[PDB]
């Protein structure tokens, strides 16, 4: 088949900067009609892939001219000229000249933005969950940057590490931030044997943890 | 207004077959080929095969070969791809897309999340999370397979929603969703989280109550 080697795997770029993604085919992708069917696709999180560039450099309507493509022979390049928050996702080159059609491995665009501190919220287990004998305490850490963040759970002042489960969103398509959800699951009997539950988030934006907590007795 | 219609999910046991369908809406079916593309998690697209309604020709990628059968029902405006003898490597999201001769993939389906596993479906247990702006949440716990869909107030509340990707633990998935609303709107107005689990055909609404 036609191999499509795409570089880089991961492309950090500041808002308004210039991104360039390269693709190198194993063979010429010129078709017998004289045209070359090199195409570039973007897969934004949660969505289907969408075409940006066709026939090496042509642009369908609705695709801004900030996206441009060029290529000779085996070597092809896609250029995003002023990165916008919505340009985040994984980009793929594609050859459509020779069956089986093939995609490159993909290049994830990461947008560098100004630092932002998390908004933190804590949530006791619902009574409906308590009726089934388990209890999950939840902490949301929303709209912060950069992506790295630490969370620590304290039950009655004592650190807890077992039963914690953390998940990060992808980068936000509108403000280029990240969010994270932390869930501590305990037995309902264990949840009822202690009083105070605390979630503390430590992030680069500040030396002091942002602390949230509750008591069941309130 | 052109659209391609695809099933949201299919749970398949190892060794069994799946049939995926792509139904066109808003264009003359025979003027475009239907192609299928496999998306592996985190990264990767693979062209799987194609069927051309005009000439009846079909092709598929040789990595799956012997296992893909591509067909079309021209009277239903529907394309089909049967994939036989599935294993864990075949779990992925499968898209269909249309292609005019010497054209490009201009329209895409929303994709079918295919999971190959011997476990049975498990609908979610959805839990409301309740305690300036107020942030409220929904915990969607203990469901298999992927995906679930989460909307707030049946989708009328779309700004300020964060839905966190599922994590697999003890062979069941868990995710959460948070919505941030003005302190003026809650609890004075109703905020409901709406969860749909296509592989079990189930739907759940949980009212966020103080």
């Amino acid at each position: 088949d036609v191999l499509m080697t795409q570089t880089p795997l991961s492309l950090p770029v500041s808002l308004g900067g210039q991104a360039s993604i390269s693709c190198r085919s194993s063979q010429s992708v010129v078709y017998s009609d004289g045209d070359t069917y090199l195409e570039w696709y973007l897969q934004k999180p949660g969505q289907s892939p969408k075409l940006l560039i066709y026939k090496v450099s042509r642009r369908p309507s609705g695709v801004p001219d900030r996206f441009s493509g060029s290529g000779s022979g085996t070597d092809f390049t896609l250029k995003i000229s002023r990165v916008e928050t919505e340009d985040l996702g994984v980009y793929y080159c594609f050859q459509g000249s020779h069956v089986p059609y093939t995609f490159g491995g993909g290049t994830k665009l990461e947008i560098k933005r100004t630092d932002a501190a998390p908004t933190v919220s804590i949530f006791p287990p619902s009574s409906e969950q308590l009726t089934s004998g388990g209890a999950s305490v939840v902490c949301f850490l929303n709209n912060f940057y950069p992506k790295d963040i630490n969370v620590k759970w304290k039950i009655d002042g004592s650190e807890r590490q077992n039963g914690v489960l953390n998940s990060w969103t992808d980068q936000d398509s509108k403000d280029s931030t990240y969010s994270m959800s932390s869930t501590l699951t305990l037995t309902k009997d264990e949840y009822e044997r202690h009083n105070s539950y605390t979630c503390e988030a430590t992030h680069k934006t500040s030396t002091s943890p942002i602390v949230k907590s509750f008591n069941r007795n309130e | 207004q052109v659209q391609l219609l695809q099933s949201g999910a299919e749970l398949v046991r190892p060794g069994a077959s799946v049939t995926l369908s792509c139904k066109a809406s808003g264009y003359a079916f025979s003027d475009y080929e239907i192609h299928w593309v496999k998306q592996t998690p985190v990264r990767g697209l693979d062209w799987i095969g194609a069927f051309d309604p005009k000439s009846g020709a079909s092709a598929s990628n040789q990595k799956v070969k012997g296992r893909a059968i591509l067909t079309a029902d021209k009277s239903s405006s529907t394309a089909y791809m049967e994939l036989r003898s599935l294993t864990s490597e075949d779990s992925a999201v499968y898209y269909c897309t249309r292609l005019r001769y010497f054209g490009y993939f201009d329209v895409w389906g929303t994709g079918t999340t295919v999971t190959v596993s011997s476990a049975s479906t498990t609908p979610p247990s959805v839990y409301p999370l309740a305690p300036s702006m107020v942030t409220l949440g929904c915990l969607v716990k203990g469901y298999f397979p992927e995906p679930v869909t989460v909307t707030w107030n049946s989708g009328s509340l779309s700004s300020g929603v964060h839905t966190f990707p599922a994590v697999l633990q003890s062979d069941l998935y868990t995710l959460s969703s948070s919505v941030t609303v003005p302190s003026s709107t809650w609890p004075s107005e109703t905020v409901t989280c709406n969860v749909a689990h296509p592989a079990s055909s189930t739907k759940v609404d949980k009212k966020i109550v103080p």
Partner: peptide, 8 residues
Amino acid sequence: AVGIGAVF
């Protein structure tokens, strides 16, 4: 892409 039926 060219299409699998373009040459018929």
